[PDB]
Amino acid sequence: EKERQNRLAEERARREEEENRRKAEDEARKK
């Protein structure tokens, strides 16, 4: 269970950092 939950949690965090770098490069284009 913990293996599964941690795997899903890192998948979530990776998607989150994807969106963060994405908004970052968007703002960069606005610059």
Task: Give 3-state DSSP helix, strand, coil % of the chain, rounded to 5.
Answer: 95, 0, 5
Total Cβ atoms within 10 A of residue 29: 7
The CA dihedral of 19, 25, 28, 30, to the nearest 10 degrees, is -70
- What number of H helices and E strands is found in the chain? 1, 0
DSSP class of residue 21? Answer: H
Give, for 31, the enclosing helix (H) or strand (E): none
The CA dihedral of 15, 19, 24, 27, to the nearest 10 degrees, is 170
- Give the SS3 label for residue 5: helix
